[PDB]
Amino acid sequence: DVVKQSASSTRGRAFVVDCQGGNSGYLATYASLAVGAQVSYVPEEGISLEQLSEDIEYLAQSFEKAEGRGRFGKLILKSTNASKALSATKLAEVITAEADGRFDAKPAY
Amino acid sequence: PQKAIAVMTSGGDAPGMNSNVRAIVRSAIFKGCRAFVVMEGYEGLVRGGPEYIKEFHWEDVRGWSAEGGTNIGTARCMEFKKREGRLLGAQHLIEAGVDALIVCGGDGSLTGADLFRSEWPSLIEELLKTNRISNEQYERMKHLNICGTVGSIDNDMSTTDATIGAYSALDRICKAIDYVEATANSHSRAFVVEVMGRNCGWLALLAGIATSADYIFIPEKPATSSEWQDQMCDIVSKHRSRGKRTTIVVVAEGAIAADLTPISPSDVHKVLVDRLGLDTRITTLGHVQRGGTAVAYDRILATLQGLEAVNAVLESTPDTPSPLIAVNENKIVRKPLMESVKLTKAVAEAIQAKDFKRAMSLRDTEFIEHLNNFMAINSADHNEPKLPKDKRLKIAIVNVGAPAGGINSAVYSMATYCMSQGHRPYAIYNGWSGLARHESVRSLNWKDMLGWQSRGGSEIGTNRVTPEEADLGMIAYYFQKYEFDGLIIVGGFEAFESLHQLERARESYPAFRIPMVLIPATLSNNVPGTEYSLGSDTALNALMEYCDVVKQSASSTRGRAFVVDCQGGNSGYLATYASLAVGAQVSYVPEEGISLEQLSEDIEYLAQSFEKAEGRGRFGKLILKSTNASKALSATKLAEVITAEADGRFDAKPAYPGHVQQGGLPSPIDRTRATRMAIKAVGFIKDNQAAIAEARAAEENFNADDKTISDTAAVVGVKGSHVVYNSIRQLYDYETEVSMRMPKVIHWQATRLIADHLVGRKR
Amino acid sequence: KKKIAVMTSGGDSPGMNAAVRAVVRTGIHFGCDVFAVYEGYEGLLRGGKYLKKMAWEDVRGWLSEGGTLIGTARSMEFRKREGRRQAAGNLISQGIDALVVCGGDGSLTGADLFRHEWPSLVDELVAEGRFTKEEVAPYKNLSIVGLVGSIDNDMSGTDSTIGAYSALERICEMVDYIDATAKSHSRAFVVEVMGRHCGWLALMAGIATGADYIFIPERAVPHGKWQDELKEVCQRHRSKGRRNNTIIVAEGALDDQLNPVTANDVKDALIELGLDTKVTILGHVQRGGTAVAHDRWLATLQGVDAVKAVLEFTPETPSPLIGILENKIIRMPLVESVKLTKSVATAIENKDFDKAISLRDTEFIELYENFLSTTVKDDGSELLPVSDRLNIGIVHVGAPSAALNAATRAATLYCLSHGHKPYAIMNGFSGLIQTGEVKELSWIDVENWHNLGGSEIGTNRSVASEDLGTIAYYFQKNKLDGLIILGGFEGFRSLKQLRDGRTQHPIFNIPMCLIPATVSNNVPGTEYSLGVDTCLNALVNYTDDIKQSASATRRRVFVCEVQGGHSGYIASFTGLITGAVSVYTPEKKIDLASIREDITLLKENFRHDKGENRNGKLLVRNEQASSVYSTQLLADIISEASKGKFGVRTAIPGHVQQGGVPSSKDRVTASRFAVKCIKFIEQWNKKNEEDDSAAVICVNGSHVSFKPIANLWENETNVELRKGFEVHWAEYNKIGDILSGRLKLRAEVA
Ligand SMILES: O=P(O)(O)OC[C@H]1O[C@@](CO)(OP(=O)(O)O)[C@@H](O)[C@@H]1O
Ligand SMILES: O=P(O)(O)OC[C@H]1O[C@@](CO)(OP(=O)(O)O)[C@@H](O)[C@@H]1O
Ligand SMILES: O=P(O)(O)OC[C@H]1O[C@@](CO)(OP(=O)(O)O)[C@@H](O)[C@@H]1O
Ligand SMILES: O=P(O)(O)OC[C@H]1O[C@](O)(CO)[C@@H](O)[C@@H]1O
Ligand SMILES: O=P(O)(O)OC[C@H]1O[C@](O)(CO)[C@@H](O)[C@@H]1O
């Protein structure tokens, strides 16, 4: 809640939040449902580059449609074991790049 | 009252003399003596004072371990033959305060040293009785202490297994033949490669084995006159007619027939053309065999011998016979100069008196073994001769773990050896996963393996899947199906684990009730039961060369060090020897780790080094770091920390040679040693049929855990050119630290120290 | 339907396999069918079996294979029309009407006599049973394309023959070994090198090994006086401190009277002077070994053009021979070149060497001139200018390259030749500023620098602007008349800086030129910085080994990160002579889209494999390709998609790309360029008793010239990506994208 409020303040920003739970997506899932996370990645599913690309486009449009409005910050909860290759940090970097100026992303641990 | 030691290289130069000189200079300065270098051999002694008998300082041999020939030169001695020459020599030494002389070179040069030593008293006397030397001097050094270090590419000094330079020459030879082979294969030609070695055939033999030559002409086995033309023509013909497009005949420069008359390359050329009528060319490598930078083995050998050579002259006394450093069963030792040269003069005699077996015995600890091995693999299946009467089994070979230089040689050698015995060799492609999932058994046909003796990579394929992971059942099944009397596993620690699994899977699956044996192989040298896994020397050279190149870089920028990430898992073997071979300043290993304290001092020591070095031209510094030496600090991060801690005084960059560490084409050592391990493994298979056989009856309570049955599942190891055998059970249960994929006791912590001393590093 | 046949006849040379592999795949790509012809003409004669339809994978790995994998035998039977007609039947039998021959000048000739004689032989077959007029119909005319595969580079018409540089490299390797031992015994070695009747090999090797003297036919030595000239030279060098002498003698060496000059003739002469002398005949080591980067590159491109030329054939077009002229690939009338080369002997028979020498490659005369002025004219004799002799300074600006010393050396010797004083500005600009250290170089100081990589005087990236004044202070203090900057972009940036500083600093008005030096080839205005070839080869040897490591473990991809800063030239070139299935450069976008098309090509490609043994695949990614997608992220993203189907590993050669020893090409170019610069300084110095005096020596498609640093510093990407604006390789790439197997894999996925 606190992190999303941040994101909503800057406008056009999403946070990739590193979540616990080892190989269990239980925590990320319910947390996600409870805060209305836009995206959530879990160990059981992984993060396929394809899924990542669509999520980035969808997110992209979200902010466009949102214009500069006040409570449109977005959250991407990511269980750490959801990917050994992409960390919450690297994920934000990739998204921000793929975003291409449209919106950016920061990591949260 | 600081004494002094001096070195000189005499006779034909040989790769590694510089490494020798470098160690002697440093070891002397380390021990507290003053180091002296004699230019242009003994001539240098006739001429005198500085310029020819120049005092050296630590930084003067900097970088030498990576340079060819002798930087201090070697000349033909004229003046020293005469007494006035030998007299001047003594004066000049005395005038330089040098009464300890170390000479590196051929035996001829060694003896000259001894004589000089004995003639010393006589000389100083005349010198006194005529001034030239003060009375103060006469007393001060009325005795000459010397020590020899034999450097030669011929490897023909009887009391030592390897002369400094020998393996380097062998490397040069195999490199030229590998080139010649490719054009030869284009035209399906035949080449007669004339090789050096003077009167020894060590080079021609090893080369032939390494390059899979069709025939070698060595002087220790003249066996012929009329025999060789038929002997050669026969096996060549069989080879060519069965597929081999090329014909490589290695000819020792000093080969002769049984009648002691010489056999020349031409002689062999003619026959190849006239009798067999094939396109033939003669190639005389000449001195390239003398050039090049010393191979890791030579650098490391010369570096150790040099150190010992100083120890020897420093403890020699008027009554001690003149020493000489050598190697026996990969162990640095002292030998009496005289006996040694006497034993060598012997060979010439034995040869001059047709007693060839005698001469052959005077060579190195494993000369004969190689010859027999060559013979076998060379004939292999081309001659029904199937040495054993139907006692021939069906043996399987497989690769498990990372690829490594020499594994293909092992396979090729094991296959062709089987063929000379009558055994039927079967290869299991792509290890256990390849067996269970694709029934990958194949029959190794001689024609299909052309070239394998010297190929890198893994022709039959390898992975890290263990038997249990591929389903033991399917394994045992196919095993039974093909009826394997014995298994030969070539590979690393996964291959170790495999052996172990298959053996303790004995009772439960009687198909494993056969003899097994593991030929260790991994550039890491982390497999228990041996001091040398296959692929090691190839990686050591790969890394060494990389480092040479990288340090050159660092020296170019001035005030710069490189942190090179090394391989070897939890084994600091590679980093250690590499480090010793390239004179790395610092080296971090897994067994020791990288304590922030040590790091700090190394950074300061490094710091001063560069300050004292000023802007000079060859002061680059290397820090070899096994990856596992620290999970926290990577070569990259290490560089960053040093660079920061450096604080502008000097900086550091990372270097990740990575996989080139596996090398390309396996080294002559790795190749020849592979066929040696391969053959003794086949031997183990046959020699262990008895036991588990007369018991491999019904899978009844006649199968247990008795040393006699377990001991048919062992690792062919080596303890200094030796060859040992140890039950996988012995090793796995008491000598292994399986949790970390490596032996419980490390056998090279001592040399780590030597290394520090040579480069001046502390704790 | 078009079937094409490739044959490799004559003496084999490194690169032929590379050549064949192109022809096969370029053909298959364009819908043709390609057939290999084993044992050369012989196999062509023997027909069937000795003639085989090649698959795409039949040539995988051929980029790193010695000699020719389809062999080369000599055939007597072909010498008779029966045999020729014989063969012609074999081809027509397979529906083949295009022959691509790669080999010595000989084979190339015979390949024409065949095309000009085919219809005729076709009739016979129509008659004497064999073929109906109907069958032999479409296969009426022969298409013939020649590729010169030879280490002699004796084919007048084309600047370089496939395998010539490889053999050169081999010579250098061997001579380098010899040096060690020769140095120890202060001896003299007479080294004999192949070359048939061409001294290109000797001449190159001469310059590349710091030889004391050479012997080439194109310059028959003074029939009776050469043994003294030689002794003179060697003696003089030895007195100056040289310990060993090295004389390179070509096989075809001869004197005025066409009397052959022998290695031993040479040896005897030296023995006479009293020097411990040995003779070494390298022999066939000059024919083996894999192809160096130049030959793999040359062979792959020329092979691709041969197929295209075939598809472009017409009844009246004459037999084309694929060559290279302004470092661009060209086609030329085969018959012409065979004659022009045939004529070389002619002029030698009539002792008209001048005529002969002009028939050799574009740069031959230049080289020879370079060699003399750098080695024999140190007599005081040749250009020892009056007293308008100069103080020339030399600095290394940038990361180490492998030709700096060799170049500094050439420049020093030349300078001394003319009586100029060559100064070494120790440790780049930062060094000068901090210490004002400028040592005068002596003949013996520069000894053996010809093959010494790194920078003996020190080199670093500090630029001139760090304290433009103190620099100027020392240039003056040292009375410099000219400046040579050896280095990369920092050097280029520095030259600009100094040009500007002229207004405020009179001393910077002395002539100043930059010899680009960097593994990256990122210096604007030139197509070749020194050290580039050395890098490319280091990368070949590097990839060759890890390529073999992937093949060993089966089903495995390596992501290899190459240097070059923000210039993918090295990346592109490497990818081509590597067969890389994917080359990520900064010039080419790296988005998820691309990565996926890459995972695709891979997975797909891997579905096949089976052949294993030699099946390892790799990606070539440039150092700065993508700030986000690092070599590691790329490798892991890829693994994760593989889903255990295959494995991935990363390769970061790193600083070894700087080399250990310069390659023969870099060693020779360094000498050329170094001298050209001393000359340029001389010219301007005399032309002053205007920025054009501050230039960069450039090479553009074979043509070397000087380019004013100012007009150039607007072809740059200055305070940004530091690289030259344009890119001259986008052709390599699209071709590479075919042979690599990329598009082929792209297709299957759809
Ligand atoms: O301090 P450590 O041992 O790293 O534990 C951190 C976290 O690991 C976890 C997983 O996030 O353990 P576990 O998987 O067993 O549930 C949490 O329980 C715990 O908060
Ligand atoms: O590419 P993988 O198969 O992971 O292996 C890389 C390296 O790991 C090593 C150790 O560095 O394996 P190993 O410990 O079994 O010797 C090397 O042999 C091998 O080159
Ligand atoms: O030694 P550092 O200064 O880190 O340079 C590393 C590499 O970067 C490069 C580019 O890859 O610099 P540069 O662009 O100036 O040529 C290489 O030349 C150099 O080897
Ligand atoms: O180089 P030289 O003086 O001809 O001596 C060559 C001899 O030296 C050796 O290298 C032994 O030192 C032999 O292999 C060779 O036959
Ligand atoms: O190998 P061969 O049959 O002796 O032919 C050698 C000749 O071939 C060449 O390599 C030319 O193809 C020459 O350099 C050499 O003189």
mmCIF file of N, CA and C in Angstrom, chain B residues 281-357:
data_model
loop_
_atom_site.group_PDB
_atom_site.id
_atom_site.type_symbol
_atom_site.label_atom_id
_atom_site.label_comp_id
_atom_site.label_asym_id
_atom_site.label_seq_id
_atom_site.Cartn_x
_atom_site.Cartn_y
_atom_site.Cartn_z
ATOM 1 N N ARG B 281 56.885 -36.945 -49.228
ATOM 2 C CA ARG B 281 57.689 -35.749 -49.025
ATOM 3 C C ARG B 281 58.465 -35.901 -47.731
ATOM 4 N N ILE B 282 59.604 -35.238 -47.649
ATOM 5 C CA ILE B 282 60.423 -35.306 -46.453
ATOM 6 C C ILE B 282 60.323 -33.952 -45.787
ATOM 7 N N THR B 283 60.241 -33.946 -44.463
ATOM 8 C CA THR B 283 60.155 -32.701 -43.732
ATOM 9 C C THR B 283 61.191 -32.713 -42.641
ATOM 10 N N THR B 284 62.059 -31.712 -42.603
ATOM 11 C CA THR B 284 63.034 -31.656 -41.521
ATOM 12 C C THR B 284 62.764 -30.419 -40.646
ATOM 13 N N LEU B 285 62.103 -30.646 -39.514
ATOM 14 C CA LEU B 285 61.736 -29.575 -38.617
ATOM 15 C C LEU B 285 62.907 -28.689 -38.196
ATOM 16 N N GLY B 286 64.084 -29.268 -38.056
ATOM 17 C CA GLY B 286 65.216 -28.450 -37.670
ATOM 18 C C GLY B 286 65.056 -27.763 -36.330
ATOM 19 N N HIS B 287 65.654 -26.585 -36.201
ATOM 20 C CA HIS B 287 65.592 -25.876 -34.929
ATOM 21 C C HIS B 287 64.267 -25.327 -34.372
ATOM 22 N N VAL B 288 63.170 -25.389 -35.115
ATOM 23 C CA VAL B 288 61.976 -24.866 -34.498
ATOM 24 C C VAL B 288 61.837 -25.653 -33.215
ATOM 25 N N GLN B 289 62.358 -26.872 -33.232
ATOM 26 C CA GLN B 289 62.294 -27.754 -32.074
ATOM 27 C C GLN B 289 63.071 -27.194 -30.890
ATOM 28 N N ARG B 290 63.946 -26.237 -31.164
ATOM 29 C CA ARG B 290 64.739 -25.647 -30.105
ATOM 30 C C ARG B 290 64.156 -24.353 -29.617
ATOM 31 N N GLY B 291 63.273 -23.765 -30.414
ATOM 32 C CA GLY B 291 62.702 -22.484 -30.043
ATOM 33 C C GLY B 291 61.406 -22.540 -29.274
ATOM 34 N N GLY B 292 60.735 -21.397 -29.233
ATOM 35 C CA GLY B 292 59.472 -21.327 -28.528
ATOM 36 C C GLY B 292 59.651 -21.032 -27.056
ATOM 37 N N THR B 293 58.548 -20.716 -26.394
ATOM 38 C CA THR B 293 58.574 -20.424 -24.969
ATOM 39 C C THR B 293 58.435 -21.782 -24.276
ATOM 40 N N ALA B 294 58.988 -21.908 -23.080
ATOM 41 C CA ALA B 294 58.891 -23.174 -22.389
ATOM 42 C C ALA B 294 57.442 -23.528 -22.037
ATOM 43 N N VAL B 295 57.107 -24.788 -22.251
ATOM 44 C CA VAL B 295 55.802 -25.341 -21.943
ATOM 45 C C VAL B 295 55.652 -25.298 -20.415
ATOM 46 N N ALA B 296 54.420 -25.195 -19.922
ATOM 47 C CA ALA B 296 54.194 -25.151 -18.470
ATOM 48 C C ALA B 296 55.071 -26.140 -17.705
ATOM 49 N N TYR B 297 55.080 -27.400 -18.136
ATOM 50 C CA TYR B 297 55.884 -28.433 -17.483
ATOM 51 C C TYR B 297 57.352 -28.038 -17.390
ATOM 52 N N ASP B 298 57.905 -27.539 -18.487
ATOM 53 C CA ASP B 298 59.300 -27.141 -18.439
ATOM 54 C C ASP B 298 59.493 -25.945 -17.521
ATOM 55 N N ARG B 299 58.649 -24.925 -17.622
ATOM 56 C CA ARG B 299 58.790 -23.775 -16.741
ATOM 57 C C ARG B 299 58.770 -24.263 -15.300
ATOM 58 N N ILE B 300 57.700 -24.950 -14.929
ATOM 59 C CA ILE B 300 57.596 -25.449 -13.566
ATOM 60 C C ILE B 300 58.758 -26.371 -13.174
ATOM 61 N N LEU B 301 59.219 -27.212 -14.091
ATOM 62 C CA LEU B 301 60.322 -28.107 -13.756
ATOM 63 C C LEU B 301 61.595 -27.329 -13.537
ATOM 64 N N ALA B 302 61.926 -26.465 -14.484
ATOM 65 C CA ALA B 302 63.132 -25.659 -14.382
ATOM 66 C C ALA B 302 63.071 -24.719 -13.181
ATOM 67 N N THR B 303 61.882 -24.226 -12.855
ATOM 68 C CA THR B 303 61.776 -23.343 -11.707
ATOM 69 C C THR B 303 62.118 -24.069 -10.395
ATOM 70 N N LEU B 304 61.651 -25.305 -10.243
ATOM 71 C CA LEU B 304 61.909 -26.073 -9.031
ATOM 72 C C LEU B 304 63.343 -26.536 -8.941
ATOM 73 N N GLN B 305 63.857 -27.037 -10.055
ATOM 74 C CA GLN B 305 65.226 -27.520 -10.098
ATOM 75 C C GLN B 305 66.184 -26.389 -9.796
ATOM 76 N N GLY B 306 65.879 -25.214 -10.333
ATOM 77 C CA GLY B 306 66.725 -24.065 -10.099
ATOM 78 C C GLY B 306 66.812 -23.804 -8.617
ATOM 79 N N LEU B 307 65.661 -23.777 -7.955
ATOM 80 C CA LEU B 307 65.623 -23.524 -6.527
ATOM 81 C C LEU B 307 66.503 -24.536 -5.781
ATOM 82 N N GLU B 308 66.332 -25.813 -6.098
ATOM 83 C CA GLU B 308 67.108 -26.876 -5.472
ATOM 84 C C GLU B 308 68.594 -26.754 -5.818
ATOM 85 N N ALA B 309 68.888 -26.377 -7.055
ATOM 86 C CA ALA B 309 70.269 -26.227 -7.471
ATOM 87 C C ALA B 309 71.001 -25.232 -6.556
ATOM 88 N N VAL B 310 70.310 -24.184 -6.124
ATOM 89 C CA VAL B 310 70.949 -23.240 -5.232
ATOM 90 C C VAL B 310 71.160 -23.943 -3.903
ATOM 91 N N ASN B 311 70.137 -24.628 -3.398
ATOM 92 C CA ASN B 311 70.275 -25.322 -2.130
ATOM 93 C C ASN B 311 71.462 -26.238 -2.153
ATOM 94 N N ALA B 312 71.654 -26.936 -3.267
ATOM 95 C CA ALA B 312 72.769 -27.873 -3.406
ATOM 96 C C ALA B 312 74.174 -27.257 -3.327
ATOM 97 N N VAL B 313 74.452 -26.228 -4.122
ATOM 98 C CA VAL B 313 75.778 -25.622 -4.057
ATOM 99 C C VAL B 313 75.974 -24.962 -2.714
ATOM 100 N N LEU B 314 74.890 -24.478 -2.120
ATOM 101 C CA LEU B 314 75.013 -23.836 -0.831
ATOM 102 C C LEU B 314 75.380 -24.817 0.279
ATOM 103 N N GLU B 315 75.094 -26.104 0.093
ATOM 104 C CA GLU B 315 75.450 -27.075 1.115
ATOM 105 C C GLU B 315 76.509 -28.063 0.644
ATOM 106 N N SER B 316 77.152 -27.755 -0.477
ATOM 107 C CA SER B 316 78.212 -28.622 -0.978
ATOM 108 C C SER B 316 79.476 -28.263 -0.187
ATOM 109 N N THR B 317 80.356 -29.245 -0.020
ATOM 110 C CA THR B 317 81.607 -29.052 0.709
ATOM 111 C C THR B 317 82.748 -29.655 -0.105
ATOM 112 N N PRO B 318 83.987 -29.339 0.273
ATOM 113 C CA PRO B 318 85.138 -29.871 -0.455
ATOM 114 C C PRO B 318 85.117 -31.393 -0.628
ATOM 115 N N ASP B 319 84.401 -32.090 0.253
ATOM 116 C CA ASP B 319 84.350 -33.551 0.170
ATOM 117 C C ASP B 319 83.127 -34.101 -0.559
ATOM 118 N N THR B 320 82.101 -33.274 -0.742
ATOM 119 C CA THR B 320 80.884 -33.718 -1.431
ATOM 120 C C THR B 320 81.090 -33.810 -2.931
ATOM 121 N N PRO B 321 80.678 -34.928 -3.535
ATOM 122 C CA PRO B 321 80.833 -35.081 -4.982
ATOM 123 C C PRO B 321 79.939 -34.060 -5.672
ATOM 124 N N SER B 322 80.355 -33.615 -6.851
ATOM 125 C CA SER B 322 79.593 -32.631 -7.608
ATOM 126 C C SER B 322 78.166 -33.092 -7.898
ATOM 127 N N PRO B 323 77.161 -32.343 -7.395
ATOM 128 C CA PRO B 323 75.735 -32.638 -7.568
ATOM 129 C C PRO B 323 75.166 -32.217 -8.917
ATOM 130 N N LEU B 324 73.939 -32.654 -9.155
ATOM 131 C CA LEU B 324 73.217 -32.368 -10.381
ATOM 132 C C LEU B 324 71.752 -32.611 -10.061
ATOM 133 N N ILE B 325 70.874 -31.670 -10.371
ATOM 134 C CA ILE B 325 69.459 -31.885 -10.059
ATOM 135 C C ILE B 325 68.695 -32.575 -11.186
ATOM 136 N N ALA B 326 67.837 -33.515 -10.809
ATOM 137 C CA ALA B 326 67.059 -34.264 -11.788
ATOM 138 C C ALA B 326 65.653 -34.558 -11.278
ATOM 139 N N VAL B 327 64.911 -35.369 -12.017
ATOM 140 C CA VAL B 327 63.565 -35.729 -11.602
ATOM 141 C C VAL B 327 63.413 -37.215 -11.749
ATOM 142 N N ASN B 328 62.848 -37.845 -10.717
ATOM 143 C CA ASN B 328 62.578 -39.281 -10.737
ATOM 144 C C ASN B 328 61.168 -39.417 -10.203
ATOM 145 N N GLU B 329 60.315 -40.134 -10.921
ATOM 146 C CA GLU B 329 58.936 -40.285 -10.477
ATOM 147 C C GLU B 329 58.473 -38.908 -10.009
ATOM 148 N N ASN B 330 58.339 -37.976 -10.953
ATOM 149 C CA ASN B 330 57.937 -36.614 -10.634
ATOM 150 C C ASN B 330 58.298 -36.234 -9.206
ATOM 151 N N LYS B 331 59.601 -36.270 -8.919
ATOM 152 C CA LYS B 331 60.155 -35.900 -7.614
ATOM 153 C C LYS B 331 61.532 -35.265 -7.900
ATOM 154 N N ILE B 332 61.714 -34.021 -7.455
ATOM 155 C CA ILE B 332 62.966 -33.287 -7.671
ATOM 156 C C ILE B 332 64.067 -33.859 -6.777
ATOM 157 N N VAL B 333 65.133 -34.356 -7.382
ATOM 158 C CA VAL B 333 66.190 -34.969 -6.599
ATOM 159 C C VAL B 333 67.608 -34.649 -7.036
ATOM 160 N N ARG B 334 68.551 -34.962 -6.153
ATOM 161 C CA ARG B 334 69.954 -34.735 -6.440
ATOM 162 C C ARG B 334 70.599 -36.038 -6.904
ATOM 163 N N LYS B 335 71.527 -35.926 -7.847
ATOM 164 C CA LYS B 335 72.258 -37.067 -8.403
ATOM 165 C C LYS B 335 73.732 -36.678 -8.577
ATOM 166 N N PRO B 336 74.641 -37.640 -8.410
ATOM 167 C CA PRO B 336 76.064 -37.336 -8.574
ATOM 168 C C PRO B 336 76.426 -37.150 -10.041
ATOM 169 N N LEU B 337 76.920 -35.951 -10.333
ATOM 170 C CA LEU B 337 77.327 -35.522 -11.667
ATOM 171 C C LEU B 337 78.035 -36.627 -12.447
ATOM 172 N N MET B 338 79.119 -37.141 -11.866
ATOM 173 C CA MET B 338 79.921 -38.186 -12.498
ATOM 174 C C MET B 338 79.150 -39.453 -12.830
ATOM 175 N N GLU B 339 78.633 -40.136 -11.815
ATOM 176 C CA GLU B 339 77.864 -41.359 -12.044
ATOM 177 C C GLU B 339 76.864 -41.101 -13.167
ATOM 178 N N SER B 340 76.137 -39.987 -13.056
ATOM 179 C CA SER B 340 75.136 -39.603 -14.047
ATOM 180 C C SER B 340 75.690 -39.543 -15.467
ATOM 181 N N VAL B 341 76.761 -38.781 -15.681
ATOM 182 C CA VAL B 341 77.338 -38.703 -17.021
ATOM 183 C C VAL B 341 77.920 -40.058 -17.413
ATOM 184 N N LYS B 342 78.474 -40.777 -16.438
ATOM 185 C CA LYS B 342 79.050 -42.096 -16.686
ATOM 186 C C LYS B 342 77.936 -43.026 -17.175
ATOM 187 N N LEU B 343 76.811 -43.000 -16.472
ATOM 188 C CA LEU B 343 75.689 -43.829 -16.849
ATOM 189 C C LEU B 343 75.188 -43.458 -18.242
ATOM 190 N N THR B 344 75.385 -42.205 -18.625
ATOM 191 C CA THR B 344 74.921 -41.758 -19.934
ATOM 192 C C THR B 344 75.881 -42.240 -21.007
ATOM 193 N N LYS B 345 77.182 -42.090 -20.744
ATOM 194 C CA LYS B 345 78.198 -42.527 -21.696
ATOM 195 C C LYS B 345 77.902 -44.007 -21.973
ATOM 196 N N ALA B 346 77.365 -44.677 -20.958
ATOM 197 C CA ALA B 346 77.038 -46.078 -21.080
ATOM 198 C C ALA B 346 76.203 -46.344 -22.325
ATOM 199 N N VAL B 347 75.031 -45.715 -22.417
ATOM 200 C CA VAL B 347 74.122 -45.914 -23.559
ATOM 201 C C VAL B 347 74.859 -45.967 -24.896
ATOM 202 N N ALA B 348 75.733 -44.992 -25.120
ATOM 203 C CA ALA B 348 76.496 -44.946 -26.357
ATOM 204 C C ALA B 348 77.203 -46.287 -26.549
ATOM 205 N N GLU B 349 77.898 -46.727 -25.501
ATOM 206 C CA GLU B 349 78.635 -47.985 -25.521
ATOM 207 C C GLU B 349 77.720 -49.149 -25.844
ATOM 208 N N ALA B 350 76.694 -49.334 -25.013
ATOM 209 C CA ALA B 350 75.732 -50.417 -25.204
ATOM 210 C C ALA B 350 75.285 -50.468 -26.661
ATOM 211 N N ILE B 351 74.977 -49.297 -27.218
ATOM 212 C CA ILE B 351 74.529 -49.200 -28.606
ATOM 213 C C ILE B 351 75.644 -49.616 -29.553
ATOM 214 N N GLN B 352 76.857 -49.139 -29.270
ATOM 215 C CA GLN B 352 78.029 -49.469 -30.084
ATOM 216 C C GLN B 352 78.319 -50.976 -30.029
ATOM 217 N N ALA B 353 77.789 -51.633 -28.992
ATOM 218 C CA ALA B 353 77.966 -53.074 -28.801
ATOM 219 C C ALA B 353 76.651 -53.843 -28.960
ATOM 220 N N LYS B 354 75.851 -53.422 -29.932
ATOM 221 C CA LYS B 354 74.570 -54.041 -30.244
ATOM 222 C C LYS B 354 73.620 -54.466 -29.122
ATOM 223 N N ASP B 355 73.972 -54.221 -27.857
ATOM 224 C CA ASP B 355 73.077 -54.594 -26.745
ATOM 225 C C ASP B 355 72.012 -53.509 -26.544
ATOM 226 N N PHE B 356 71.000 -53.573 -27.395
ATOM 227 C CA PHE B 356 69.930 -52.603 -27.396
ATOM 228 C C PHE B 356 69.057 -52.583 -26.149
ATOM 229 N N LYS B 357 68.743 -53.751 -25.584
ATOM 230 C CA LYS B 357 67.903 -53.784 -24.387
ATOM 231 C C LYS B 357 68.547 -53.008 -23.234
#
